[PDB]
Design a protein around this ligand. Sequence first.
Ligand SMILES: *[C@@H]1O[C@H](CO)[C@@H](O[C@@H]2O[C@H](CO)[C@@H](O)[C@H](O)[C@H]2NC(C)=O)[C@H](O)[C@H]1NC(C)=O
Ligand SMILES: *[C@@H]1O[C@H](CO)[C@@H](O[C@@H]2O[C@H](CO)[C@@H](O)[C@H](O)[C@H]2NC(C)=O)[C@H](O)[C@H]1NC(C)=O
Ligand SMILES: *[C@@H]1O[C@H](CO)[C@@H](O[C@@H]2O[C@H](CO)[C@@H](O)[C@H](O)[C@H]2NC(C)=O)[C@H](O)[C@H]1NC(C)=O
Ligand SMILES: *[C@@H]1O[C@H](CO)[C@@H](O)[C@H](O)[C@H]1NC(C)=O
Ligand SMILES: OC[C@@H]1[C@H](O)[C@H](O)[C@]2(O)CC[C@H]1N2
Ligand SMILES: [Ca+2]
Ligand code: NI
Length: 641
Amino acid sequence: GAYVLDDSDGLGREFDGIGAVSGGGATSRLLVNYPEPYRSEILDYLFKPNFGASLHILKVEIGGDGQTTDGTEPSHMHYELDENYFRGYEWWLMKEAKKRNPDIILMGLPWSFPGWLGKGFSWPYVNLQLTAYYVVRWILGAKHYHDLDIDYIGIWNERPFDANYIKELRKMLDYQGLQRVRIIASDNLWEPISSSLLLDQELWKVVDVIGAHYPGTYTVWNAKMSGKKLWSSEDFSTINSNVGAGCWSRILNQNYINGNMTSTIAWNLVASYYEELPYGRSGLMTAQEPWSGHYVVASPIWVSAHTTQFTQPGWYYLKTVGHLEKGGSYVALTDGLGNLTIIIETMSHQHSMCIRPYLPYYNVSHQLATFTLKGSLREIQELQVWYTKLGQRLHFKQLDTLWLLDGSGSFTLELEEDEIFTLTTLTTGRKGSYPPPPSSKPFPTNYKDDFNVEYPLFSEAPNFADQTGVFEYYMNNEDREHRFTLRQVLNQRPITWAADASSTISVIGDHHWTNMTVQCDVYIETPRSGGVFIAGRVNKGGILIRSATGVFFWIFANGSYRVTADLGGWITYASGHADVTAKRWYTLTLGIKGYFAFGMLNGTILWKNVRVKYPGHGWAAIGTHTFEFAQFDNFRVEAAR
Ligand SMILES: *[C@@H]1O[C@H](CO)[C@@H](O[C@@H]2O[C@H](CO)[C@@H](O)[C@H](O)[C@H]2NC(C)=O)[C@H](O)[C@H]1NC(C)=O
Ligand SMILES: *[C@@H]1O[C@H](CO)[C@@H](O[C@@H]2O[C@H](CO)[C@@H](O)[C@H](O)[C@H]2NC(C)=O)[C@H](O)[C@H]1NC(C)=O
Ligand SMILES: *[C@@H]1O[C@H](CO)[C@@H](O[C@@H]2O[C@H](CO)[C@@H](O)[C@H](O)[C@H]2NC(C)=O)[C@H](O)[C@H]1NC(C)=O
Ligand SMILES: *[C@@H]1O[C@H](CO)[C@@H](O)[C@H](O)[C@H]1NC(C)=O
Ligand SMILES: OC[C@@H]1[C@H](O)[C@H](O)[C@]2(O)CC[C@H]1N2
Ligand SMILES: [Ca+2]
Ligand code: NI
């Protein structure tokens, strides 16, 4: 009926901000080679204040060289004694975010770890000081090399925590003058972290925020008792159609209302990874075509704006928030300066499903909502109105100001299903607009890269999406013909988050490709036991990279070759001997058309008219037999979709 909004009995919890995740894993991979101005425009839609999603929080993966959902991300310490703070693209992304929003909040969190941290075990808690040292060096490097202040450091994404590790991490941060860095734990479920904090005063002292993943808007009693800030430190992960916007809309309000969570952070920030990788197009917007410049400002961007443009971290929720009589919810916030923001959502069940969890049916129907401003809100003769209707549709439209000048501090509105209203004293709102970007286009059907770049802007050549191992631009000054190559740089299995393959692999191109010729120069660095491959029709990647089938053309340093149907090498198409050794360059060609494949070694047929599965489709790929050094040069692909 009537809903009272008031602050005379005090405020709710402090609001900590809305954010998104770049990482877990390689979700921003394809953003870095967007041409200008589109790349800058994408970033404006994400981070520019009073424009698009206007995000308050950016959380990034701390790469550990393992597969972490849509690819690998490179570590700052590939090996013991190795330190490099310029690999990958999270440094670049954090700086671009800070340029747009100097007050953006920065978080880092590991998914995988370089294998050498485990000292012979796939376990990061073998040497607590060593793992803490590794993580803290990332934070120091962020400051020393990029002028980035990391505000929050997590533990181990969706993996066990170790209470002694968390304490050592606090001790190490303090030892390095990083008292201001806060710890969030444990980026998994509410338990066991929540009860651990009630039982261990020392643990309680060093954990600042309980961060839980996909809580379905609820928390648990132990977490409320702790007194700690509670965050949905990872949510969303739903395709960014209108359904995902509805999911984002509902949980943004109800994570606080139902579970006292004062921050929600969406996985992921932007869908800049091939769509047929796991969880495709599950970013706040889509930018997965750097070759064309095409991107899509999806509905979740404007759902975000309904909160972010009219709140800031440090505002406070009112005590008077809740659900509507006939479905939906409302929150309200103030900044203690006379501003008020009211956010109303009526997302229907059929149109707001997240992937995790699935809610049983709830009803939503037309209703009239009356709001009355009591307490300090009593003045406020006017409020600005921003409106979105999902599903068709209209996004983030500014409507006529509502006037409360009748002395009652009261208004009403006709709500229907799947709407968002933001009513605010703030006058800074804006629906940012750039002109439309180029039309969508498939990955180029002829594509080449000679890797000849002496000072690359990023550590890896464009469009190559590593799915196990790490491939990087490599300069060999002791050579003239292959001075600039692409090298696989892992020499041992990471402490894995995913089930990384036993072979390294980087995929590129158009997943719909069915007939293709792939060519590449390859160089095997390990004598006798080394091996490399080129492939096509590679059908799976990311978390499922172990499952990948296709056509794989292997050569080995013992003078042999293999043609397999699977990355694991269990299914043989052909095999035989080849004039192949380590430490010399060979040019591999693989042609796949219809039912048949052929392979050439240095332009001479090695095997031909070999029967392969068909129909079949997938990316092109390169890689190495195990975690071993190898180089690649003069990559070429021609394909038909
Ligand atoms: C966390 O939020 C819950 C609600 O989601 C608060 O719970 C009680 O909620 C009912 C109705 O939902 C109110 O009538 C009670 O007054 C609330 N309890 C109290 C003590 O006020 C709960 O208070 C919140 N916990 C915090 C802020 O620590
Ligand atoms: C609403 O918010 C704005 C921005 O936070 C407030 O205006 C600022 O007020 C502070 C002092 O309170 C000044 O130092 C800033 O220069 C102001 N900035 C802008 C952009 O105006 C405003 O006071 C708040 N209250 C109301 C009723 O608007
Ligand atoms: C990929 O290659 C196969 C084999 O050449 C193509 O299939 C043939 O297409 C022709 C003309 O379209 C037909 O007359 C044949 O009967 C097809 N054969 C088979 C076995 O399908 C296929 O169309 C090609 N696809 C692309 C996208 O180029
Ligand atoms: C939802 O509520 C309305 C109003 O009470 C009712 O008419 C309608 O049948 C309900 N729908 C479901 C699926 O419960
Ligand atoms: O929905 C998938 C999500 C994504 O893959 C993130 O990497 C993760 O941390 C791991 C699973 C979940 N959260
Ligand atoms: Ca080269
Ligand atoms: Ni497919």
